[PDB]
C-alpha cells in the first residue's frame, strides 16, 4: 500500500493503485484493491500506514452513504473532498492520527466535469489534472508534465498511465505487483480488467 | 565538551566591474549578543593586487589569510618574483582549505582583483575548498538579505523593458565604480537595519590597475 496515481482527462478520472500488501519480508497479497466507492460517481483510492488506510476509507464511505440516504442526493466531488480534508485535518492533531493519504476521483453530474483531488494525511488538499502520493510522483510527474493534455480521451489517458507504470516498474526498487485501474465518468465507476 | 568553533558574525561582499573590483565587509565583531569590537578589519590587502576576506570563525579566518599572505611571499621566492595571478591565487587557496578537509577552516572566503586581461575578478570559496569565479557575491551573516538585491540591481533579474511586457529583458549594461559603491553602501545599510550582527562600520577595498584603495563608511551602532 504505497503506490496510487490519478489522472483527470476530458470526460473521466482514472485512478491506478498497486496490488501489493507486505507483512514483514513477505508479500501477502498481489490483488489488493486500495479503493472505496463513496458514491455512484465518486471513487477514493488510499495509501499509508497499515490498518488506518482501510478503517479511514470505510469510515468516510459510511458517512457519505449516510448523507446520500438522508438527503436522497449525491454530494459533489468537491463537497466530498472538503469533508475528507476536514476529517484528516481534525485527525492530525488527535492523540493518534490516521496516517492516510488519498486521491478522490469524481465526476460532477451538475457541472458535467471530471475532478481529481489529492489529499495527504495532514489535510493538505489540492485539485489537480494528475496526482500521486509518496514517491510515486518522483518517477511519473516528468512523463505526465510532458505528455498530458486536458482534452485527452480515456484511451489516451490509459496509454499515458501505462507509460507511467512502466517507468515505475523500471526505476523503483520495490515490486508493487502491477496496478488496478478504475475509470470514473458520467455513467459511474468501472474497472479496467486487463492492464 | 569543547567546541573548537565559534561565530564572529560579519558580512562581506565582492563585486567585479569591467576594469575594477571591490571587496567590502562590515567592521563589527561579535559573540552571541555582545559586541567585541566595532572596528576589527576583516578585508585585507594580501599583495600582488589581491584582496581577501575570510568570513565566519575569526580565528580560522585570520589563520587562512595569514597563510595565504605567506603563500604569496614564497611564490615570489620560488618563482623569481613573478606576480601571482588572481586565478593562480584562487587555486592555491583551494589547496590551503582542502588540507583541512577533516577539520575545516569554518570560513566562507572571497578574493578580488584583476585577471590577466585586466578585467575585474571575484572568486568565492566554501569552507572545504570548492571555488568559482563570479561577478557578484555576498557572504556571511546577511548574505541572504543582500544577494537577491544584487541579482536585481546588478544583473537586472526579473526586470524587463517597458512596453514589451516580458518579451524583452533589460540589457546588461556595465556598472561604474561609483555606481557599484552605491549598491554596496545601500546593501549594508539595508542589512544593518534587519540584521543585528551587521553594523558599526563598513570598509571597502577597491582594486584597479593603479593599485588598492580603501574607503570607510559609518553604520548604525545599535
Amino acid at each position: 500500500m504505497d503506490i496510487i496515481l490519478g489522472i483527470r482527462v476530458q470526460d473521466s478520472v482514472i485512478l491506478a493503485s498497486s496490488k501489493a500488501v507486505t507483512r514483514g519480508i513477505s508479500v501477502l497479497k498481489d490483488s489488493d484493491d486500495k479503493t472505496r466507492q463513496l458514491s455512484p460517481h465518486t471513487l477514493m483510492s488510499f495509501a499509508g500506514e497499515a490498518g488506518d488506510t482501510v478503517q479511514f476509507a470505510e469510515y468516510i464511505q459510511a458517512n457519505i452513504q449516510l448523507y446520500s440516504i438522508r438527503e436522497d442526493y449525491e454530494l459533489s466531488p468537491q463537497a466530498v473532498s472538503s469533508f475528507v480534508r476536514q476529517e484528516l485535518a481534525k485527525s492530525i492533531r488527535s492523540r493518534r492520527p490516521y496516517q492516510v493519504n488519498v486521491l478522490i476521483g469524481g465526476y460532477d453530474k451538475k457541472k458535467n466535469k471530471p475532478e481529481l483531488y489529492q489529499i495527504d494525511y495532514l489535510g493538505t488538499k489540492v485539485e489537480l489534472p494528475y496526482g500521486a502520493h509518496g514517491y510515486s510522483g518522483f518517477y511519473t510527474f516528468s512523463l505526465l508534465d510532458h505528455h498530458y493534455r486536458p482534452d485527452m480521451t480515456t484511451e489516451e489517458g490509459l496509454d499515458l498511465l501505462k507509460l507511467c507504470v512502466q517507468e515505475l516498474e523500471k526505476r523503483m526498487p520495490m515490486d508493487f505487483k502491477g496496478v488496478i485501474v478504475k475509470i470514473v465518468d458520467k455513467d459511474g465507476i468501472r474497472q479496467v480488467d486487463d492492464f | 565538551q569543547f567546541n573548537p568553533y565559534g561565530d564572529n558574525g560579519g558580512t562581506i561582499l565582492g563585486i567585479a566591474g569591467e576594469d575594477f573590483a571591490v571587496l567590502a565587509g562590515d567592521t563589527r565583531n561579535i559573540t552571541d549578543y555582545s559586541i567585541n569590537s566595532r572596528y576589527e578589519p576583516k578585508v585585507f590587502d594580501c599583495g600582488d593586487n589581491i584582496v581577501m576576506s575570510a568570513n565566519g570563525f575569526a580565528a580560522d579566518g585570520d589563520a587562512l589569510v595569514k597563510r595565504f599572505k605567506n603563500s604569496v611571499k614564497w611564490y615570489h621566492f620560488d618563482h623569481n618574483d613573478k606576480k601571482l595571478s588572481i586565478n593562480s591565487a584562487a587555486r592555491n587557496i583551494q589547496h590551503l582549505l582542502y588540507s583541512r578537509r577533516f577539520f575545516p577552516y569554518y570560513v566562507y572566503n572571497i578574493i578580488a582583483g584583476l585577471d590577466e586581461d585586466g578585467k575585474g575578478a571575484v572568486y568565492s570559496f566554501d569552507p572545504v575548498g570548492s571555488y568559482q569565479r563570479e561577478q557578484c557575491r555576498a557572504g556571511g551573516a546577511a548574505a541572504s538579505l543582500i544577494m537577491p538585491f544584487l541579482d536585481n540591481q546588478v544583473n537586472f533579474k526579473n526586470q524587463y523593458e517597458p512596453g514589451t511586457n516580458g518579451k524583452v529583458k533589460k540589457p546588461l549594461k556595465y556598472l561604474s565604480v561609483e555606481e557599484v559603491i552605491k549598491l554596496v553602501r545601500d546593501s549594508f545599510t539595508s542589512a544593518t537595519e534587519r540584521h543585528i550582527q551587521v553594523g558599526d562600520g563598513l570598509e571597502i577595498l577597491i582594486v584597479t590597475k593603479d593599485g588598492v584603495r580603501k574607503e570607510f563608511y559609518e553604520l548604525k551602532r545599535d
Binding site: 514517491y135 510522483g137 512523463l143 517507468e167 526505476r171 | 577533516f102 575548498g129
Partner: protein, 211 residues
Amino acid sequence: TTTLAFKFQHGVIAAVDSRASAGSYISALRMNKVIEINPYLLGTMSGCAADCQYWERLLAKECRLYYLRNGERISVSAASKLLSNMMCQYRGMGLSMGSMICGWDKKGPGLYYVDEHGTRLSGNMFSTGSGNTYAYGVLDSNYKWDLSVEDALYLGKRSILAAAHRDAYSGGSVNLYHVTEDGWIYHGNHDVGELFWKVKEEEGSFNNVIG
C-alpha cells in the same frame, strides 16, 4: 542537483543543472557541475562540490602523468578506476561524491558512474542528484542508440528541465557537453527560466502551467 549522461551512436551527452542550496536558501544560481579533466575527459559532480572538484582535478594530474609516461592517452575505464581507488582510501571518512566519467577512447565512447562508496559502474545511461528520477523518465522514454547529435543534445537538455521544474533543489541553468573522439564540445549555458517557456510553447508540454 541534477546530472545525467548517456552514450549514443555519435559519442556521449552530458547535461547538468546549476543550482546550489544552503537549506531553503539558494546559495548559487550558476555553479559549474562539470569538471573539464582534460580535452577528452569529463566528470560530473554530485554531493560535496569540494570533494568532486579536488579529487577530479587530482585525477587529471594522474591522467596527464599517465600520458607522459606511456605516450598514450588514458582509457575511460582506467581513469574511472583511478578515481574509484582514491575514494577507497578515505572509505568511511565522510567524503561525498557522485560523478559520471565521460570520454572517448579506443573502445569507442565510454561512460562510468563512480560514487564515494568506491562503486564503479559501466553503462549507457546514468543520472544523479535530488532530481535524477524526473530526468530518468524523460530519458527512458525517448532514448535510442540511433539518436542524432542534435536530438541527443535536446534530450539531455529536456531531461534536466523536467527535473529543474519539479525538484526544488534543481534549476538555474543547463550546461551541455558533447563528447567526440576528437574531444569534448561545450554546447552552452541555457537559463531554465527562458528555456521552460520556450519549450512549453514549441513542444506543447507543461500544459498545467499557465504562461
